[PDB]
Design a protein around this ligand. Structure first.
Ligand SMILES: *[C@@H]1O[C@H](CO)[C@@H](O)[C@H](O)[C@H]1NC(C)=O
Ligand SMILES: *[C@@H]1O[C@H](CO)[C@@H](O)[C@H](O)[C@H]1NC(C)=O
Ligand SMILES: *[C@@H]1O[C@H](CO)[C@@H](O)[C@H](O)[C@@H]1O
Ligand SMILES: [Ca+2]
Lengths: 188, 404, 393, 119
């Protein structure tokens, strides 16, 4: 045997893209660069690289998302009274009472953004082994306006933000590259 | 096995740019990564400050008989008193209090929200749209008193959108396609069946269409200034950085609107023969929906309904069709290279155009999927941020479709 | 298989145009890209600035005794001092102080939007009703009162429109055709429906045209020397043609098609196919985007939905069909080198006819045929052939 | 450091002299805006706008399988004294775009997939 069922959804609110020159940083970020030594002071450069970030998203996507993999092997329920089209129909039915039954168990939840009330209601219905109603998804979708999450991102390393006016600018950027290169070996 | 990042370093260093007080470098990316081996995040080009080795030239670039705007734009002088915003700074209009009048005398009129976002920048990396290189706030003193759109009420068309129109066209398509096949024999008893489904649906709700004026174009102060910063010297990764963050192209053709689409693909097989007892079953199922444009309350309400056996309520479509008034998406367009907007009447502009085209060719060649390794079995190569890979909804598995 | 973009070299530089202060050459597309190879974009005309090699001529181009408006467009004093603002930049307050009232002495009258959009430009690429070359807000100082269209209310008709006759037509054309055969059994269906409503027809005046300040001044800006890029830029921003007349209205069209067959030893087979489509244009959104959906389903329609949809065409028409006139007929003589502009607009349109030819793209596989799109020659095919070149099934 | 004819900021920045009076918090805690009350000239000509909460957090600092607890290295409270604006189609409200964010496009797009393969 091999078997899986997936349900996946996107809610997309907007695209952001950002500058690569004439950038204005927070003063607290360029202060953290002005405090770096001229030397490859690896412990301090790893301190900075976790005091703001290793990379940044030169662009991303504001929204919300779900992935709800049914690890459930169909035959775990399909031996009892439900056809393949009927279990589908119940997930999105009279042949058993699947919403009352202990039969649906192994559905995973990943849910991103929106107000906790609605995210919880979707999660609670899924772990009980029950489908969400279309009412529930539109209520969730309305709430992503208050609480977005990044669905996907396109990435660049943080040393690109270091201003060209910085005393020892190229040396610091080259030492941040030397530090970024070590992370890949620091973690197995 | 999967493939991590490969590159070679700068191998060059510019002299100091006199007016810009800076120097540049750019490096050869070989392979960003394949099959989820680790990304090349490191920079395609970088720059360093220099105290310049010679004087800068005369910095002014005055267009002459045109007014040199406080933004650095250029325009016909008289408009600077008219209540049109010519300048990219309203207070140049505030300055000339002596001849204030708007471009229309008695008209009561709206801003076209379709015209404001007309001429999006685009990046070929995903056909991402980007905010307009174009100004779209200036009227060129033209009254241009249109009344298109479903409310039949006046709007003014800003100087860059030569055409903008609000055409009310729709189309919808349906296909549902089904097969069943059976083979059975005896000598040993053998039986088998196959079942197939295909669906396509789409529907288009057009709102409008546009074209951008290819001469005397009026640009965002930022775009016309963000040409000034350019190296003049074909520093590959720097012209790549402008192409990355104002886009490879700017466009003008429109289908603005809402759109929906669906597919089902289902394909199913079962086989048995019969002491000896042998059997197999194979089945692939896939169903997908898309919605774009309109407001959340109705467009997100529709998106899931489309997949189901559920017959959709016609007034839900009518509420969506109304909401596309507020929230269009660009369904189709005509691309034009971004360099056509670096204007005449600015220093070294042709050399800046030459470098922008060569950097578009570099954009085309370094993202080229021809560099990546062959996908296995029935698949074909896919590109994503920092990696090549492939995937196959067709009885194949793994990040290169290696196995079945 | 997939094919990439290809172009000529860049032609040798023009000399410096004296008044335009620029110099260019061009680059022909050979192949736009085909079958999802790397699609073309890159420019066919591009230009460099020059400090000119000789003097520009005297810049004024006034039509003699005519009034020199702030547009620099040729007009006569009756058009300005009667308050009508014909000359293109609302200047009339400068011209007269005593009784400058509009030509409709007391009986001042509304305009029409369906009239204003008359003489849309059109382009063989995309066939778009580009916004008017004509300045339909010029009225030639005429009061010119229609009372036509279904709003049962008066309107002033624009100078460049000979008439906007609301010559109404509503036509439904319908066909069905079906067959059955048995020995095995076969069943076949075709359905076609179209409905057309013509609200009216506009005709553009064939002499004495008033063009938009932008159209006339954007031909003043031409090279004078046969350079593709600036001529193509005028084409691509104003049309290859103007609609010298056309029909405003709405349209719907539908199809359904079905084709069905059915046919120790145990052998059998079944075959089926389905194809359904709907189109709507014109009318206000609520009714149109009801009806285009509504008619794709079998639903026996409320006649009041047809009445509401097609009533709304009075407020929101689409151009059903029109008479194309080659665009250069709109360079008004009594302008400097006016005919040399005509000549090279025609030569640039002939150059348009050269590179956008699909015929030179490579053959699609199996039962297919080639189409051209923005940077791709491509095909789509019968008999379940597949991929953008139809090489497989 | 030394902004020349332009203005040197409290926690170390340069603000162009035209910015300082406008109302935009050019230099942190409104420390740009000490006294210019004779010429407080706005970026927008009395247009209604509210500050984009969806973009003020954009440009998050990122780690390999992680993201920052403190909002950004970029300063999304900076606007170059421009008024350039995007809008929410859902409430019809206009927002200024932070000058870090080269583009905001607000798009309503919903995509949903169900899938199984079985053997
Ligand atoms: C095959 O499986 C069926 C299941 O009912 C069983 O009855 C039959 O005896 C099996 N045949 C064999 C043993 O090959
Ligand atoms: C028909 O199907 C049966 C199923 O067992 C098979 O045994 C037989 O060979 C096929 N031919 C006949 C019976 O027509
Ligand atoms: C001359 O034309 C060539 C094409 O052969 C270009 O590559 C070059 O940039 C220049 O325009
Ligand atoms: Ca002005």
């Amino acid at each position: 045997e091999k078997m899986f069922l997936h349900v996946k959804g996107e809610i997309h609110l907007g695209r952001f893209v950002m500058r690569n020159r004439d950038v204005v940083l927070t003063t607290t970020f360029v202060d953290d660069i002005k405090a770096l030594p001229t030397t490859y002071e690896k412990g301090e450069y790893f301190a900075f690289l976790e005091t703001y970030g290793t990379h940044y998203s030169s662009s991303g996507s504001l929204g919300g998302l779900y992935e709800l993999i049914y690890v459930l092997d169909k035959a775990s329920m399909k031996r009892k009274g439900v056809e393949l089209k009927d279990i589908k129909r119940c997930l999105g039915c009279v042949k058993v009472n699947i919403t009352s039954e202990n039969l649906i168990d192994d559905v995973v939840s990943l849910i991103r953004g929106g107000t906790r009330k609605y995210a919880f209601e979707l999660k609670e219905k899924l772990l009980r082994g029950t489908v969400i109603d279309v009412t529930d998804f539109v209520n969730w979708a309305s709430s992503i306006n208050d609480a977005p999450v990044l669905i996907s991102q396109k990435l660049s390393p943080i040393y690109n933000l270091v201003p060209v006016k910085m005393k020892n600018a190229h040396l610091k950027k080259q030492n941040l590259e030397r530090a970024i290169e070590d992370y890949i070996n620091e973690f197995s | 096995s999967h493939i991590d990042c490969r590159m070679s370093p700068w191998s060059e260093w510019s002299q100091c740019d006199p007016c810009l007080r800076q120097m540049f470098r750019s490096r050869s990316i070989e392979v960003f990564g394949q099959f989820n081996g680790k990304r090349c995040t490191d920079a395609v080009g970088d720059r360093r400050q220099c105290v310049p080795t010679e004087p800068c030239e005369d910095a002014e670039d005055d267009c002459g008989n045109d007014f040199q705007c406080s933004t650095g734009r250029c325009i016909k002088m008289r408009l600077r008193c008219n209540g049109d915003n010519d300048c990219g700074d309203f207070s140049d209009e505030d300055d000339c209090e002596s001849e204030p009048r708007p471009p229309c005398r008695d008209r009561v009129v709206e801003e076209s929200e379709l015209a404001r976002t007309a001429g999006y920048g685009i990046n070929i990396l995903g056909m991402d749209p980007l905010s307009t290189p174009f100004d779209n706030e200036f009227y060129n003193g033209l009254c241009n008193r249109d009344r298109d759109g479903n409310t039949l009420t006046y709007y003014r068309r800003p100087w860059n959108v030569a055409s903008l129109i609000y055409e009310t066209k729709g189309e919808k398509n349906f296909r549902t396609e089904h097969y069943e096949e059976q083979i059975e024999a005896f000598k040993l008893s053998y039986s088998s069946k196959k079942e197939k489904m295909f669906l396509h649906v789409k529907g288009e709700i057009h709102l409008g269409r546009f074209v951008m004026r290819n001469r005397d174009v009026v640009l965002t102060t930022t775009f016309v200034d963000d040409i000034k910063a350019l190296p003049t010297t074909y520093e590959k990764g720097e012209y790549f950085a402008f192409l990355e963050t104002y886009g490879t192209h700017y466009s003008s053709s429109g289908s603005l609107g809402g759109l929906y689409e669906l597919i089902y693909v289902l394909d199913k097989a079962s086989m048995k023969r019969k002491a000896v007892n042998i059997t197999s079953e194979n089945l692939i199922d896939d169903v997908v929906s898309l919605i774009r444009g309109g407001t959340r309350k109705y467009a997100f309400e529709l998106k899931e309904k489309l997949l189901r056996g559920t017959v959709i309520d016609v007034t839900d479509f009518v509420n969506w069709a109304s909401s596309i008034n507020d929230a269009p998406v660009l369904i189709s367009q005509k691309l034009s290279p971004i360099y056509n907007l670096v204007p005449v009447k600015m220093k070294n502009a042709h050399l800046k155009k030459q470098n922008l085209e060569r950097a578009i060719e570099d954009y085309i060649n370094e993202f080229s999927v021809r560099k990546c390794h062959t996908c296995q079995n029935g698949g074909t190569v896919i590109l994503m941020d920092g990696k090549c890979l492939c995937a196959c909804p067709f009885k194949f598995e793994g990040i290169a479709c290696e196995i079945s």
